Amino acid sequence: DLLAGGKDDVKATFGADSFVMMCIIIAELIVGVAMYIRTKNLLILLGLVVVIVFTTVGLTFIK
Amino acid sequence: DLLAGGKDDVKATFGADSFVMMCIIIAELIVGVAMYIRTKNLLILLGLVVVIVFTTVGLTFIK
Amino acid sequence: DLLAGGKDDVKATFGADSFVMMCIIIAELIVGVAMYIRTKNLLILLGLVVVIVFTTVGLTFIK
Amino acid sequence: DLLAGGKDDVKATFGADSFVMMCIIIAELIVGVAMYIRTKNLLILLGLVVVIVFTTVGLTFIK
Amino acid sequence: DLLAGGKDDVKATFGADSFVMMCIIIAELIVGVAMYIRTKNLLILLGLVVVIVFTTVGLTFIK
Amino acid sequence: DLLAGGKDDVKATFGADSFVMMCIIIAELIVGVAMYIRTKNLLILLGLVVVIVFTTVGLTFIK
Amino acid sequence: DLLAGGKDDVKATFGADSFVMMCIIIAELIVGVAMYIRTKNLLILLGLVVVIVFTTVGLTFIK
Amino acid sequence: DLLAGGKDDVKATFGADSFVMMCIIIAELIVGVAMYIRTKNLLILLGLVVVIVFTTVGLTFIK
Amino acid sequence: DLLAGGKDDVKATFGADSFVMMCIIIAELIVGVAMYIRTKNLLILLGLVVVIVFTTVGLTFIK
Amino acid sequence: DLLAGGKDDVKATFGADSFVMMCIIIAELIVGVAMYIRTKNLLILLGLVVVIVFTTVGLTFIK
Amino acid sequence: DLLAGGKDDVKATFGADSFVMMCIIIAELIVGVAMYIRTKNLLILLGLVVVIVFTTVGLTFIK
Amino acid sequence: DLLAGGKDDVKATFGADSFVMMCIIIAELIVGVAMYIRTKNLLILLGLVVVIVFTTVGLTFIK
Amino acid sequence: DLLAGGKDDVKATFGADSFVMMCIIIAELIVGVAMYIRTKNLLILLGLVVVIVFTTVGLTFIK
Amino acid sequence: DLLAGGKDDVKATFGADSFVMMCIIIAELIVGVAMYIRTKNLLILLGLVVVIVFTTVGLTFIK
Amino acid sequence: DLLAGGKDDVKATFGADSFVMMCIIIAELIVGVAMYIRTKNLLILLGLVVVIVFTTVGLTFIK
Amino acid sequence: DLLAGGKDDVKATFGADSFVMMCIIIAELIVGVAMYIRTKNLLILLGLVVVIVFTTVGLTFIK
Amino acid sequence: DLLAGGKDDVKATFGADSFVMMCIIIAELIVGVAMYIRTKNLLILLGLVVVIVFTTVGLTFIK
Amino acid sequence: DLLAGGKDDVKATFGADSFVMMCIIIAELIVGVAMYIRTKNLLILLGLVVVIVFTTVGLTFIK
Amino acid sequence: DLLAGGKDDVKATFGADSFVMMCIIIAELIVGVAMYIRTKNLLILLGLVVVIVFTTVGLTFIK
Ligand SMILES: CCCCCCCCCCCCCCCC(=O)OC[C@H](COP(=O)(O)OC[C@@H](O)CO)OC(=O)CCCCCCCCCCCCCCC
Ligand SMILES: CCCCCCCCCCCCCCCC(=O)OC[C@H](COP(=O)(O)OC[C@@H](O)CO)OC(=O)CCCCCCCCCCCCCCC
Ligand SMILES: CCCCCCCCCCCCCCCC(=O)OC[C@H](COP(=O)(O)OC[C@@H](O)CO)OC(=O)CCCCCCCCCCCCCCC
Ligand SMILES: CCCCCCCCCCCCCCCC(=O)OC[C@H](COP(=O)(O)OC[C@@H](O)CO)OC(=O)CCCCCCCCCCCCCCC
Ligand SMILES: CCCCCCCCCCCCCCCC(=O)OC[C@H](COP(=O)(O)OC[C@@H](O)CO)OC(=O)CCCCCCCCCCCCCCC
Ligand SMILES: CCCCCCCCCCCCCCCC(=O)OC[C@H](COP(=O)(O)OC[C@@H](O)CO)OC(=O)CCCCCCCCCCCCCCC
Ligand SMILES: CCCCCCCCCCCCCCCC(=O)OC[C@H](COP(=O)(O)OC[C@@H](O)CO)OC(=O)CCCCCCCCCCCCCCC
Ligand SMILES: CCCCCCCCCCCCCCCC(=O)OC[C@H](COP(=O)(O)OC[C@@H](O)CO)OC(=O)CCCCCCCCCCCCCCC
Ligand SMILES: CCCCCCCCCCCCCCCC(=O)OC[C@H](COP(=O)(O)OC[C@@H](O)CO)OC(=O)CCCCCCCCCCCCCCC
Ligand SMILES: CCCCCCCCCCCCCCCC(=O)OC[C@H](COP(=O)(O)OC[C@@H](O)CO)OC(=O)CCCCCCCCCCCCCCC
Ligand SMILES: CCCCCCCCCCCCCCCC(=O)OC[C@H](COP(=O)(O)OC[C@@H](O)CO)OC(=O)CCCCCCCCCCCCCCC
Ligand SMILES: CCCCCCCCCCCCCCCC(=O)OC[C@H](COP(=O)(O)OC[C@@H](O)CO)OC(=O)CCCCCCCCCCCCCCC
Ligand SMILES: CCCCCCCCCCCCCCCC(=O)OC[C@H](COP(=O)(O)OC[C@@H](O)CO)OC(=O)CCCCCCCCCCCCCCC
């Protein structure tokens, strides 16, 4: 059988609605605008979108 | 269940009416005019508009 | 609630009647005449007008 | 309140009777005659007039 | 399904009655007259018409 | 077999009716008119058409 | 004989119909249009074609 | 005489048809397209060819 | 075999009855009359005829 | 012997009846008429003919 | 004596009838027509000829 | 006397007819045509000639 | 002695009976008639003669 | 004394009867006729003569 | 006294009759004709003369 | 008193007539002509003069 | 209370009449003329003025 | 009080009659004539005058 | 006092009777005739006179 195996709730800690998933997404926003202002090209504002989908489709592979 | 999960008020710190959202928007204005004067083309004054909408529609994805 | 949230007076520093808003407008004038003399076409003298309105209608979005 | 806000005398430096306003107007004269002699059409001598009024009505917007 | 998908109101920001659609059309007018006066041929005054229709029939392709 | 293979819905995120496909097409419009006004030649207004078809026939190759 | 030799299904992970081959092709599309709009020359829209064939004829060399 | 000398099958592990020779070639493909998209010059797609021949003519020197 | 090869409907987009073929012919009319009025010689009104036949016999070479 | 040598079908992709050979010929038509209308001299309509023959006699040198 | 000296078949890989010699010649054709259409002068169509002879008389110096 | 002094055949490895002298010359050809196509000026095709003579007159200084 | 020195057949490529010498002479004819029709003076039809002799007596200086 | 000093035969490579001196003279011919046809003035056909003498009297200064 | 001071023969290596002084002068010739053909103005053929005298009167300052 | 103070002859090593002062001046000549040929403007040939005087009036400050 | 708080005379070291304020202003002059001569546009001579006022109004904020 | 404050004689080094003020003025002369000869317009000879006055009225601000 | 202050003889190097003042005047002559022949208007032959006086009255300001 499995040991240490536990709980999982660790998943709920890092999961969909979380504190860490909430700060990791807000940093993408705030330094996304930063690296935009210093440059002014737009692929970087789109760089926020790839974090939205990545975390979303990423978290479903945890199970 | 969730841990560390907290408060959120961190959202209120970086949210709609905030100090950091107030300075990140005012820098777009002041270096927007800068890179305009050194060049004098207008897509850059419009570069302020894309920060208005980006932060606005961005903050609603935090939840 | 909000943290760091402060004062604002930072707004009064960069606001309507300010030192930085006073120098950023005077540079538009002095390099506006410059790029005019080296060329002598008039859309550039009008380039001062777009800084007048931009800062004016820009500062009202800070709030 | 305001910070950095200062003095203004910076205005007196770039203002009506100044050193920089005195040289920026004298360059209009000397390269105005230049681009006239190489061509000999008169709208360019009139190009000095638009610098007279522009700086005059421009400086009053600083305040 | 779709993510990030949002709102749209971004469309209302750049749409038919807007601030940016209002300034992008007024620049066509003011530099249209400019490039007319320096030349005096009329296809350029007609250059304003092609911006009227282009934005109009353009915005309907957004959906 | 395949791993990581997933979902696809990533396709629905960047697909036909999307948020990113909606902004990438609206930028073609707004800087299309820009580079038109500064020049006034028409192949550039047609530059919007090639983005319409390119994204359309492009997205069908994703599968 | 061979060791570690395995499975292959790793091939099916990166192969013809895949998740990674699906995202690597969609990035060519979205930054292809980007570098087009900022420039407006067409060899770049054709830059999508060379990724179609390259991955296609590339994957057949894996075996 | 020779000691430790063994088997060789280690050669079959890293040889022509292998697992490691299969992944080392597939990385050339996937980061070849990457460094292409971020740049769009073609010598890099040809960078896959030099890995094909190098491993091929390289493995024959093992003996 | 062929890749990327597609659809064609791109042909229907630029083909006989189209939007772009409709605007490219109407510009010949409107600037044809222009360059006529400023001059008043008639080979230019005939310049519309050569666009009629050119697009007609041109489109049949696409296949 | 030869390596990487492949398929060719790459030839069929860029060959006689193709998608890229179909768009590269249709651009000659549409910007041929453009540079004609802005000028109205006819060697440019003949510029379409030299693309017909060039691609035709060019493709036969690929082999 | 010589080491590493090998095979040559590397020559057959890059030689007369090859895959890389087939793509390097087809790019000359497709961007030759490109830089022609954007300009319409003919020395560039002749630019394909100098690649024909250069590779031909070049490959004979390999030995 | 001399030590380590050996053989030379290392000279035969890098000498006139060699594998490395064969690949170092073929790269000059293939990236010579590359940097030609992206530009179309001819001093670069002549850049192959200076590698022919340089290696030739260079190798004779080894002794 | 000489290096790179080759073949010549490059001479036969650009020589008397050639493909490039055949197209360079036919362009003189077709744009000779063009610039004649738009003007109707005859020194230009004679402009074809000077290309006949120039290439003829020119090619003999190659050796 | 002198080092590296060599051979000269490098002189024979670029000298009187050479491959590079043969192509550098044939380009003068072929783009000489080009820039003639697009213009039809004759000093340019004479531009071939100045290359004949220049290379001739130039090569004698090498020694 | 002096150290390292040597020989000079380094002077004879780069001096009047040398290998490097022979190639540095022949490059002036071959790219002199190049930049002439692409332009056809004559100050550039005279650009060879200034290299003749410069190296001549330059080398005498070495001592 | 002074220690380590020595000899000077180090001065004679780097002084007026030296080996290092002889090579540092000859490099100015040889890369002076280089950067001239690639450009053909003359301030650079004069760049040799400023090294003549600089070393001359420089060495007298050593004492 | 305050510690380390000292003297100030550090202010007198970097203050109005100082050694460092005297060299920092003289460098603006000497490299101001430099970047002027290499270019010859005049906003740079005015670059000395902005250092005059900046240090002046800057030093008053130290207190 | 002040420290490091010194001497000034640094002023006498860069002052009115100096070595560096003597070379910085002579470069304006020699590259002034250069950029004149390559162009032949006269505002540039006047560019020497603005260095005369600038250094003169500049040095008086050092104190 | 002054440092670095030297000699002047640098003045004698660039002064009235000099090598550099001798070549800078002879270039005015030789490219003066050039730009005359290609045009045949006479203000340019007079362009030599303005170099005579400019260097003459210029050198007297060095002191
Ligand atoms: C778990 C699945 C992982 C799949 C990830 C796929 C990555 C494959 C890489 C493709 C080519 C690399 C392009 C280099 C990047 C490149 O060349 O562009 C560079 C660009 C930012 O520009 P830079 O500031 O780096 O400056 C470079 C510029 O000069 C070039 O325009 O990258 C971005 O961040 C913009 C993103 C927009 C592009 C969107 C593509 C769609 C992405 C979707 C994948 C979502 C992941 C979900 C997974 C959970
Ligand atoms: C979260 C959603 C993210 C979506 C972001 C969409 C980005 C897709 C990129 C499209 C093509 C890139 C064009 C390159 C940019 C380009 O070529 O123009 C360049 C231009 C500035 O010009 P530069 O100084 O860089 O000089 C280049 C010039 O020579 C070209 O005119 O960019 C700007 O900053 C002007 C912005 C006006 C254009 C407005 C477009 C509408 C934007 C709306 C999106 C709002 C985001 C909201 C998200 C919260
Ligand atoms: C916050 C709101 C942002 C909205 C900004 C709107 C920008 C949209 C761009 C429209 C087309 C771009 C034209 C390119 C510019 C162009 O083609 O002209 C070029 C012209 C200067 O000429 P250049 O020296 O660049 O040389 C180019 C010339 O050859 C063309 O005549 O631009 C100027 O600086 C003159 C401005 C007069 C035009 C006034 C327009 C009215 C503006 C009002 C917006 C005020 C902003 C307030 C926001 C706070
Ligand atoms: C702060 C307020 C800014 C408002 C500025 C107004 C600019 C609007 C542009 C109007 C049409 C542009 C005409 C192009 C210019 C054009 O086509 O003429 C060109 C002409 C010089 O000729 P060029 O050497 O460029 O050669 C072109 C010739 O072939 C055409 O005759 O421009 C001048 O410098 C002459 C100025 C006389 C014209 C006086 C007009 C009255 C001006 C008053 C504004 C004073 C500003 C005060 C602000 C402080
Ligand atoms: C989304 C759909 C895009 C379709 C765009 C169609 C563009 C096809 C180009 C046709 C030939 C190009 C002519 C070159 C232009 C040319 O030769 O004229 C040049 C002329 C301006 O003259 P310039 O100052 O450039 O000087 C050139 C003069 O010497 C020639 O008279 O262009 C204009 O801006 C005037 C526009 C009047 C012509 C109106 C035509 C009707 C247009 C309707 C399309 C509306 C677009 C709606 C889309 C939303
Ligand atoms: C996926 C399939 C990819 C195929 C792409 C085909 C590209 C082949 C390039 C042909 C010659 C290049 C011409 C250079 C461009 C050139 O010379 O014109 C230049 C012109 C813009 O003018 P510029 O501002 O660059 O100034 C240059 C001017 O002086 C020349 O008139 O380009 C445009 O953006 C106008 C587009 C109208 C032309 C429409 C052509 C039809 C296109 C259809 C393809 C749709 C793609 C769908 C794929 C999803
Ligand atoms: C795809 C096939 C391409 C074939 C194109 C044939 C072009 C050969 C050029 C012949 C001589 C050039 C004459 C210069 C032009 C010239 O000298 O006239 C000049 C004239 C316009 O006059 P401009 O305003 O340029 O001022 C010049 C005047 O002073 C001279 O009268 O050109 C026109 O646009 C009028 C067209 C009427 C002439 C009709 C001819 C029949 C054309 C039929 C071809 C249809 C093409 C179909 C292809 C799809
Ligand atoms: C692979 C084989 C390559 C051979 C290519 C041959 C190119 C040799 C250049 C000859 C002289 C250059 C003339 C400059 C061009 C010149 O002076 O005319 C200029 C003319 C266009 O006029 P522009 O708008 O450039 O304005 C210039 C005018 O003022 C002069 O009338 O060029 C064209 O595009 C018209 C083409 C009609 C001429 C047809 C000639 C027959 C061509 C056949 C070759 C087919 C290639 C097949 C290869 C696959
Ligand atoms: C291995 C042997 C290497 C020998 C290479 C010889 C190169 C010597 C350079 C001569 C003068 C340079 C002219 C600059 C180029 C120049 O001024 O023309 C420029 C022209 C293209 O025009 P662009 O678009 O650069 O615009 C410039 C125009 O405004 C000038 O018309 O160059 C071409 O690509 C056309 C080629 C036709 C000319 C054919 C010449 C015959 C070539 C034969 C050599 C074959 C090589 C075989 C080797 C394997
Ligand atoms: C062992 C002996 C070493 C001696 C080497 C001699 C190098 C001296 C440098 C002379 C001036 C530098 C010119 C810069 C280069 C320059 O300005 O041209 C630049 C040109 C390539 O053009 P780029 O693409 O760099 O673009 C620059 C262009 O805009 C200028 O046309 O250089 C080449 O690769 C073409 C070579 C043709 C020139 C042939 C010269 C004859 C060479 C013979 C030496 C053979 C070596 C044998 C040794 C084994
Ligand atoms: C390799 C040897 C090079 C030698 C080339 C000799 C060129 C010397 C220039 C003489 C005076 C220039 C006259 C300007 C030209 C001039 O004033 O006429 C202009 C005339 C064309 O008229 P346009 O359209 O330029 O309009 C100008 C008219 O208004 C004047 O009637 O030129 C031609 O193309 C006609 C040619 C007939 C003249 C035939 C002369 C015999 C030529 C024989 C040389 C054959 C070369 C063989 C070499 C391989
Ligand atoms: C090594 C020795 C170097 C000495 C080179 C001498 C160059 C001195 C420049 C004199 C005045 C410049 C004239 C500008 C050129 C100018 O104004 O004419 C321009 C003319 C070509 O006309 P474009 O197409 O540039 O258009 C300009 C026209 O509108 C003017 O008619 O130049 C040529 O290529 C024709 C050459 C015939 C002239 C032959 C002259 C005899 C040359 C003999 C030297 C042989 C060199 C041998 C050295 C190895
Ligand atoms: C060691 C001694 C150094 C003294 C060097 C003297 C350089 C002083 C610069 C004078 C004014 C600069 C003119 C810019 C150059 C300029 O405006 O012309 C430009 C011209 C080449 O024309 P570009 O292709 O750069 O195009 C520009 C054209 O549009 C202008 O006609 O320069 C040359 O290479 C031609 C050389 C003929 C001129 C001969 C002059 C006599 C030179 C004698 C010096 C020999 C040096 C021996 C030293 C060992």
Residue numbers in the entry:
A (entry chain 3E), B (entry chain 3D), C (entry chain 3C), D (entry chain 3B), E (entry chain 2B), F (entry chain 2C), ...: 2 to 64
Paper text:
Conjugative pili are widespread bacterial appendages that play important roles in horizontal gene transfer, in spread of antibiotic resistance genes, and as sites of phage attachment. The pilus is a polymer of the VirB2 protein (or pilin). The structures of the pED208 and F pilus are very similar, with overall dimensions of 87 Å in diameter and an internal lumen of 28 Å in diameter. Thus, selective binding of PG to pilins occurs in both F and pED208 pili, and thus, the F family of pili are polymers of a selective and stoichiometric protein-PG complex unit.
For pED208, a 3.6 Å resolution map was generated in which α-helical secondary structures, as well as most side chains, were clearly visible and in which a model for the pED208 pilin, TraA, could be readily built and refined with excellent stereochemistry. During the process of helical reconstruction, as the resolution was increased, an additional separate density became clearly visible and readily interpretable as a phospholipid. For pED208, the angle between adjacent subunits is 28.2° and the rise is 12.1 Å, while for the two F pilus structures, the helical parameters were 27.9° with a rise of 13.2 Å and 28.1° with a rise of 12.5 Å, respectively. The pED208 TraA pilin is a 64-residue protein, 63 of which (residues 2–64) were clearly defined in the electron density. TraA folds into an all-α-helical structure, containing three α helices (α1–3). TraA orientation within the pilus is such that the loop between α2 and α3 is located within the lumen of the pilus, while the N- and C-terminal ends are located on the outside of the filament. As resolution increased, clear density resolved the head group and acyl chains of a phospholipid stoichiometrically interacting with the pilin. Two main species bound to the pilin were identified by daughter ion fragmentation as phosphatidylglycerol (PG) species, PG 32:1(16:0, 16:1) and PG 34:1 (16:0, 18:1). Each lipid molecule makes extensive contacts with five surrounding TraA subunits, while each TraA subunit interacts with five lipid molecules. In the lipid, only the head groups are solvent exposed and directed to the lumen of the pilus.
